[PDB]
Amino acid sequence: KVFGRCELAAAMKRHGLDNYRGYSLGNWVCAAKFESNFNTQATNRNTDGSTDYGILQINSRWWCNDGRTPGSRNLCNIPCSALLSSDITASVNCAKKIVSDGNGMNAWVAWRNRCKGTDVQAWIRGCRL
Ligand SMILES: [Cl-]
Ligand SMILES: [Cl-]
Ligand SMILES: [Cl-]
Ligand SMILES: [Cl-]
Ligand code: NI
Ligand code: NI
Known part of the structure; x- marks a missing residue:
């Protein structure tokens, strides 16, 4: 999806x-x-x-x-294929473990290089949440 x-x-x-x-x-x-x-x-x-x-x-x-x-x-x-499902539950559960492992979101190199320190609130602009 x-x-x-x-x-x-x-x-x-x-x-x-x-x-x-x-x-x-x-x-x-x-x-x-x-x-x-x-x-x-x-x-x-x-x-x-x-x-x-x-x-x-x-x-x-x-x-x-x-x-x-x-x-x-x-x-x-989890089998890695379970992380490809339309329902994101397994990815989220897994991400919670990753981000708890000591280095926070720096575990995702692309987050460190492209998100960290930026105006990340822009990503939820306009959303009815
Ligand atoms: Cl393996
Ligand atoms: Cl979902
Ligand atoms: Cl935000
Ligand atoms: Cl987008
Ligand atoms: Ni493995
Ligand atoms: Ni990667």
């Missing part, structure tokens, strides 16, 4: 991401824009041989199982 901007903002808010670990909703929408372009089916191979999955490009090296990432963990206890 390709979410609209406000559509994703509403789903993330319903699933408890607004202000999760102190990160406002716009931070999460911004991350998803630059990770996946709001496309739940997005997959991208990483240079280390792991793959990123879904709306927030969650990495098979630590977080989900894809069966082809040696020496990798599955800390969200």
Whole structure:
């Protein structure tokens, strides 16, 4: 599913991401824009041989199982394909663990490089939330 901007903002808010670990909703929408372009089916191979999955490009090296990432963990206890679903529940649950791991949203390099410190509230402008 390709979410609209406000559509994703509403789903993330319903699933408890607004202000999760102190990160406002716009931070999460911004991350998803630059990770996946709001496309739940997005997959991208990483240079280390792991793959990123879904709306927030969650990495098979630590977080989900894809069966082809040696020496990798599955800390969200989920097949990586479950992070591609139209329903974002598994991605959100997993993202909550990631953002709690010590470095906050810096876990998403694209968030650090493209969202961090910017006017992230712009990402929820006009949304009826
Ligand atoms: Cl947009
Ligand atoms: Cl915001
Ligand atoms: Cl694996
Ligand atoms: Cl959803
Ligand atoms: Ni990535
Ligand atoms: Ni894995």
